[PDB]
Ligand binder design. Structure first.
Ligand SMILES: O=C(O)[C@H]1O[C@H](O[C@@H]2[C@H](O)[C@@H](O)[C@@H](O[C@@H]3[C@H](O)[C@@H](O)[C@@H](O[C@@H]4[C@H](O)[C@@H](O)[C@@H](O)O[C@@H]4C(=O)O)O[C@@H]3C(=O)O)O[C@@H]2C(=O)O)[C@H](O)[C@@H](O)[C@H]1O
Length: 304
């Protein structure tokens, strides 16, 4: 197998994002050192088998750091990633991948962020992994335009418009770090489709919503589904999910951690009235728990 590791430095905190193709994961260990020498690294954490991200806030600046992540299987096999520090050619803006998995090997891409009224990567029943979207060249992020798409270990240094848009059947977010400065992270426009969030997808900075079933799209309708099983918001966010109840949307949220979380701060699942473009405006009903459209108990959300 293989483990590909990437690092994002935001607000004096080091965020690690990795993808692994190991099958029966038992645990994952994070190693950190003050030099390049792997032999001098030390275990600063032993994590569970599902997370694909890690936050190291116990670092002092002025000092460079090297990181490695060791993915261990049930058969105790150890798949150590490449080193990342604070010190393929197919992944370029405007690219379209179809019916395959493209490993971007941790490269950075971007164009620019327009000022008016443009997808960076379009996936048609495909998967993209180990990709970093630059701070200025975000455009309209990643578009899943058909079939099942997986966006694995993608780091958004900043979000220009939308981080990822589900215009397909199923959009799965596995791990990844999404940063934004003052917004829509996951935009869902297709109908009879699902958006899955796991691998502890992490949002940092300032955000609007983690996920929003389009409220006023042209030819709007539903149903649209969201299933969050693992995610973390280490910053401020207006709300987590926005469902159109009149359209049959269902948001199921568990395994979510939020920095300084408190009832209504921020609201998690909110119900709206969806409208067709031009035929009115979208009104917010409010935050809801354990309803037909908002399937999330207070047990599924906790303070980071
Ligand atoms: O004509 C189209 O179909 C259009 O689709 C894409 O754009 C999407 C929406 O059509 C567009 O109006 C916008 O919508 C978002 C959000 O999804 C929508 O619910 C609404 O959000 C309101 C409020 O305006 C926001 O500021 C915030 O407070 O949230 C509110 C809410 O009810 O949740 O308006 C939003 C917005 O204006 O950005 O973006 C949608 C998107 O997928 O990005 C295409 O991008 C567009 O070109 C066109 O094809």
């Amino acid at each position: 197998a293989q483990t590909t590791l990437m690092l994002s430095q935001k607000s004096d905190v080091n965020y690690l994002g990795w993808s692994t193709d190991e099958s029966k994961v038992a645990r994952q260990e994070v190693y950190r050192g003050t030099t390049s020498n792997p032999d001098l690294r030390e275990r600063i954490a032993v994590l569970d088998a599902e997370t694909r991200t890690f936050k190291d806030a116990d670092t002092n600046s002025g000092l460079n750091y090297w990181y490695w992540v060791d993915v261990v299987s049930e058969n105790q096999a150890q798949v150590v990633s490449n080193a990342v520090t604070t010190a393929s050619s197919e992944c370029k803006p405007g690219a379209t991948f179809e019916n395959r998995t493209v490993d971007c090997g941790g490269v950075t891409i971007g164009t620019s962020c327009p000022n008016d009224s443009k997808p960076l990567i379009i996936l048609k029943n495909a998967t993209v992994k180990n990709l970093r979207i630059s701070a200025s060249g975000g455009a309209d992020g990643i578009h899943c335009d058909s079939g099942n798409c997986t966006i694995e270990n993608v780091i958004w240094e900043d979000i220009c418009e939308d981080a990822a848009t589900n215009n397909g059947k199923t959009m799965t977010i596995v791990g990844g770090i999404a940063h934004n400065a003052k917004d829509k992270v996951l935009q869902h426009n297709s109908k009879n489709s699902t958006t899955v969030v796991k691998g502890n997808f992490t949002l940092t900075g300032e955000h609007g919503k983690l996920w929003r079933s389009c409220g006023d799209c042209s030819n709007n309708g539903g149903p649209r589904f969201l299933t969050v099983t693992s995610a973390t918001v280490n910053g401020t966010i207006d709300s987590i999910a926005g469902v159109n109840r009149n359209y049959g949307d269902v948001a199921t949220i568990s395994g979510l951690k939020i920095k300084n979380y408190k009832e209504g701060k921020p609201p998690v699942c909110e119900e709206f009235k969806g409208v067709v473009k031009g035929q009115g405006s979208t009104e917010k009903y409010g935050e809801k728990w354990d309803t037909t459209n908002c399937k999330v108990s207070r047990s599924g959300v906790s303070k980071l």
